[PDB]
Amino acid sequence: ITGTSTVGVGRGVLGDQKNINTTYSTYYYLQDNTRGNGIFTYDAKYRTTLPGSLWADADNQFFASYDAPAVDAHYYAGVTYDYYKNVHNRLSYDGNNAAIRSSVHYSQGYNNAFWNGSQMVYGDGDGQTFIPLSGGIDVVAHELTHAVTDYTAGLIYQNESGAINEAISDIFGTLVEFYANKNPDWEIGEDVYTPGISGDSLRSMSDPAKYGDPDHYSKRYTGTQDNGGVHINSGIINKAAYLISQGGTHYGVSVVGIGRDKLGKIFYRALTQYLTPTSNFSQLRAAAVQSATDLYGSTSQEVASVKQAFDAVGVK
Ligand SMILES: [Ca+2]
Ligand SMILES: [Ca+2]
Ligand SMILES: [Ca+2]
Ligand SMILES: [Ca+2]
Ligand SMILES: [Zn+2]
Numbered sequence: 001i002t003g004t005s006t007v008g009v010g011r012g013v014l015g016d017q018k019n020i021n022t023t024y025s026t027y028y029y030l031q032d033n034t035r036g037n038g039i040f041t042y043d044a045k046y047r048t049t050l051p052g053s054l055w056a057d058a059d060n061q062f063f064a065s066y067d068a069p070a071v072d073a074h075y076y077a078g079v080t081y082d083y084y085k086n087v088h089n090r091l092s093y094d095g096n097n098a099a100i101r102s103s104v105h106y107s108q109g110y111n112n113a114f115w116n117g118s119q120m121v122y123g124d125g126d127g128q129t130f131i132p133l134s135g136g137i138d139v140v141a142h143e144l145t146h147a148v149t150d151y152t153a154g155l156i157y158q159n160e161s162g163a164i165n166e167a168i169s170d171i172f173g174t175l176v177e178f179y180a181n182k183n184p185d186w187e188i189g190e191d192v193y194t195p196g197i198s199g200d201s202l203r204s205m206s207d208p209a210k211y212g213d214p215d216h217y218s219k220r221y222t223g224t225q226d227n228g229g230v231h232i233n234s235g236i237i238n239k240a241a242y243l244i245s246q247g248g249t250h251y252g253v254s255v256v257g258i259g260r261d262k263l264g265k266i267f268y269r270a271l272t273q274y275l276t277p278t279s280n281f282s283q284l285r286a287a288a289v290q291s292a293t294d295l296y297g298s299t300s301q302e303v304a305s306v307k308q309a310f311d312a313v314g315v316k
Contacts, residue, residue, distance in 0.1 A: 008062065010063060010068075028057040035082070036092040050116065073132075074102065081100060087261075109127060110123030128194070149271065158227035160281050167240075174260070236315070243255045244258055244266075
């Protein structure tokens with residue numbers, strides 16, 4: 001839209017109030033004209049035709065229980081964009097202020113949300129297994145991170161590489177949840193995964209095995225399904241990535257933590273300046289070790305911790 005940037009206001013999936021950036025012209029559309037070449041959001045209309053119709057509001061106030069996904073799936077994108085900019089110095093996913101489009105209410109009770117290649121997508125959850133996946137910021141960045149991983153590495157979404165793509169998308173998906181310091185945990189989607197059981201999550205990074213995810217490269221799932229096990233064997237890298245930030249004695253291997261804002265810059269550099277489509281775990285090791293060297297010389301604890309943290313989860 002050609003229009004006048006303002007600020008409206010609306011309510012998340014988990015009902016927080018939050019000023020949003022919206023674009024008046026006739027109506028108020030959910031076009032944050034402030035970051036990048038814009039961050040747009042479209043009503044899918046519980047249907048599949050993408051990206052749907054750009055979101056519009058009449059009074060510029062989004063509190064209706066149909067807007068909760070759009071808004072949460074909007075505020076959270078600009079917080080992510082914020083991150084990648086206000087740390088890593090990256091301008092939207094492409095790197096050159098690409099326009100972050102988003103669709104919400106994509107199909108009936110679709111228990112999922114993804115990067116379609118062009119754009120982030122979001123369901124409303126079935127209402128047993130999920131609530132609107134806009135609702136989690138964890139969820140937004142992961143699926144946005146996927147796009148970064150497109151326009152940097154291009155790690156192909158099967159086998160080890162695939163397990164990496166998601167892992168990154170777990171890794172910066174957390175490092176983004178800690179940016180906003182919004183009940184920040186090393187967990188994946190508790191806030192909007194199963195309302196009927198507060199105190200759980202789809203995945204974990206501190207302990208994946210709790211949700212059927214391996215925490216070593218001895219327990220690496222092979223079979224053709226999950227595209228080799230992308231949404232599974234990730235768990236190895238979740239642990240690795242996690243262990244580094246935090247530290248701990250995994251299968252008897254005394255790692256030493258370096259905080260989450262030294263995990264970022266490493267995975268990011270590796271993500272951006274070291275990885276390939278065809279990047280197995282072992283190379284991820286080389287890539288994280290190397291990064292550390294660039295970022296903190298070899299004889300630093302950083303290179304030493306990465307080596308330790310991959311030495312834990314069975315990667316050489
Ligand atoms: Ca309204
Ligand atoms: Ca949380
Ligand atoms: Ca979380
Ligand atoms: Ca839950
Ligand atoms: Zn994903």
